[PDB]
Design a protein around this ligand. Structure first.
Ligand SMILES: OC[C@H]1O[C@H](O[C@H]2[C@@H](O)[C@H](O)[C@@H](CO)O[C@H]2O)[C@@H](O)[C@@H](O)[C@@H]1O
Ligand SMILES: OC[C@H]1CNC[C@@H](O[C@H]2O[C@H](CO)[C@@H](O)[C@H](O)[C@H]2O)[C@@H]1O
Length: 349
């Protein structure tokens, strides 16, 4: 078929499965959330928490689906249909090494639901406690062993792919042991080889040698807020792609529709980026496409805490809070606008 409605399998959308309901999970997990203290504020801070009631959830926006459980099969089915609408072929699943049965259950449900709609799943490996190259290898082995035969498990030209959040917290001399073909615990030329995509944060002076010396296969930028880092400043993307191509690396810029996290980080107003009826999203996605990259990542499907979500949101005013919403656009606008940009991306690919 050549209808311009097909999934794009070089488009990765960052997905969070940490939401709960009292009924399914025992608590409205993540809808309730601690308010972060000000890193530059007083020493006697009692910031408190967001209770995660119907009236007061840990987001500046409000989900169309309500305080949903990420364990709810019917929520998962709706999410996969939303992925189909957005034409986002790859769900990049947050992964925190929780080693508990409820997470294992969610991962299986997600894979199954994804496959029903021909969506693929890869893992976004987060900075879990004591993360290091040895337990990363062990966890990569576990994930590939457990899920590698699942039909929804993502592969690019035969290789799995992982995004590694805050990869800079691990020294290149450690990374090399895992990622150099010569490394003492290398995954290269093994059953566990994978495209490893590290987080490009700061200036080329620092990041270029880091990426080369760590032997990452590529890099992404994550942050939805333009200018938050050098990597998340879209005017740098042409130059970043040039370097990537010169050095055999895969550049996967992250684009987002906006940013606001002030419910959970009330001191962090400087990072707010307004959606302005979709123009912000358009500007950022346009920059990614114009940079001539082979793959794009979307921050995010449902990071509701950070207000970067493309998942449908609805207008809501409670006695506790007046939520932001999609303004002059319909709840599914960011899904359909994503499909539009996926089309433009494919057009120039
Ligand atoms: O200050 C809150 C800040 O937290 C996150 O970013 C973290 C870290 O993960 C990241 O590597 C660096 C990049 O400079 O910033 C840290 O403080 C993230 O949630 C961000 O959006 C937020 O503003
Ligand atoms: O997925 C990468 C990145 C995206 N932003 C959130 C990061 O996690 C951190 O912040 C959230 C709230 O936004 C907290 O709930 C987490 O505990 C914290 O680690 C995440 O790593």
């Amino acid at each position: 078929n050549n209808l311009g409605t097909e999934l794009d399998y070089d488009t990765f959308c960052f997905y969070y499965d940490w939401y709960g309901s009292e009924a399914i999970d025992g608590q409205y997990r993540h809808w309730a959330h601690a308010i972060a203290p000000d890193p530059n504020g007083g020493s006697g801070q009692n910031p408190g928490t967001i209770p995660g009631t119907q009236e007061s959830i840990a987001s500046n926006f409000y989900p169309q689906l309500g305080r949903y459980s990420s364990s709810d099969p019917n929520i998962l089915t709706k999410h996969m249909d939303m992925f189909v609408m957005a034409r986002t072929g790859v769900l990049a699943l947050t992964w925190w090494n929780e080693q508990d049965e409820t997470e294992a259950k969610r991962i299986g449900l997600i894979l199954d639901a994804a496959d029903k709609k021909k969506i693929k799943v890869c893992f976004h490996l987060e900075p879990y406690p004591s993360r290091n190259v040895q337990n990363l290898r062990e966890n990569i082995v576990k994930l590939i062993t457990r899920y590698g035969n699942h039909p929804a498990f993502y592969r690019k030209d035969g290789k799995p792919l992982f995004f590694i959040y805050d990869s800079y917290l691990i020294e290149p001399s450690e990374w090399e042991k895992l990622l150099s073909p010569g490394g003492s615990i290398t995954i290269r030329n093994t059953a566990y080889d994978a495209l490893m995509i590290g987080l490009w944060t700061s200036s080329p002076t620092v990041q270029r040698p880091f990426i080369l010396n760590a032997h990452f296969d590529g890099f992404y930028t994550y942050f939805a807020a333009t200018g938050f880092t050098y990597g998340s400043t879209p005017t740098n993307w042409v130059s970043m792609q040039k370097w990537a191509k010169e050095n055999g690396k895969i550049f996967i810029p992250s684009v987002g529709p906006g940013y606001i996290d002030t419910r959970i980080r009330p001191w962090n107003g400087s990072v707010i980026r307004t959606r302005t009826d979709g123009q912000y999203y358009d500007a950022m996605y346009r920059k990614a496409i114009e940079a001539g990259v082979s793959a794009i990542s979307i921050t995010s499907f449902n990071e509701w805490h950070e207000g970067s979500q493309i998942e449908p949101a609805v207008p809501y005013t409670s006695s506790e809070f007046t939520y932001l919403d999609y303004e002059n656009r319909e709840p599914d606008y960011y899904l359909t606008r994503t499909a539009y940009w996926v089309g433009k991306f494919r057009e120039s690919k």
